[PDB]
């Protein structure tokens, strides 16, 4: 048992921060990070699935994600554009 977002663990969040140059992490950053990560995924996924639904498909494609990302101003290279 346990929540899915809680699946995104402390050590993992630590690792991300570390690649970000962060030397010390307050204990409150973990719940804060999951919330941000959740708002990010919601916005991207919502857009991707909207491209999916428009193409009348049932399968979210990398392109749908790339276009969602492009609209959120987060252009991604490596997946078809």
């Amino acid at each position: 048992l346990r929540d899915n977002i809680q699946g995104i663990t402390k050590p993992a969040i630590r690792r991300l921060a570390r690649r970000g140059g962060v030397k010390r992490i307050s204990g409150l950053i973990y719940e804060e990070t999951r919330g941000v990560l959740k708002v990010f995924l919601e916005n991207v996924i919502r857009d991707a699935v909207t491209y999916t639904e428009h193409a009348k498909r049932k399968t979210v494609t990398a392109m749908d994600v790339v276009y969602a990302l492009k609209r959120q101003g987060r252009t991604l290279y490596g997946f078809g554009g």
Binding site: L16, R19, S26, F79
Partner: protein, 97 residues
């Protein structure tokens, strides 16, 4: 009975993770979260393997970036420990809020 001083390993991980490029969040947990969120927008969705990969890449690139801007605030507040208000300041000046 050897023990490293607090911060010495922290710096070491920074050097390690800034050198590597692997995804830092475990795949399955992520996949789980993604599908859960996606499930609230349209049910019974399937996902291209690369779609999941594209998604995770974007998220980690966003969190690492957000952690950089948050660190700039901490050093700005003459601190060294990131706090929620620091992430909150960064997201605000970024326009995400």
């Amino acid at each position: 009975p050897h023990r490293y001083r607090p911060g010495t390993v922290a710096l070491r991980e920074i050097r390690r993770y800034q050198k590597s490029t692997e995804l830092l969040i475990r795949k399955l947990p992520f996949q789980r979260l993604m599908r859960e969120i996606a499930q609230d927008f349209k049910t019974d969705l399937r996902f291209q393997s690369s779609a999941v990969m594209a998604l995770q890449e974007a998220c980690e690139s966003y969190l690492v970036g957000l952690f950089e801007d948050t660190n700039l605030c901490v050093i700005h507040a003459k601190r060294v420990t990131i706090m929620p208000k620091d992430i909150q300041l960064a997201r605000r000046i970024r326009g995400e809020r």
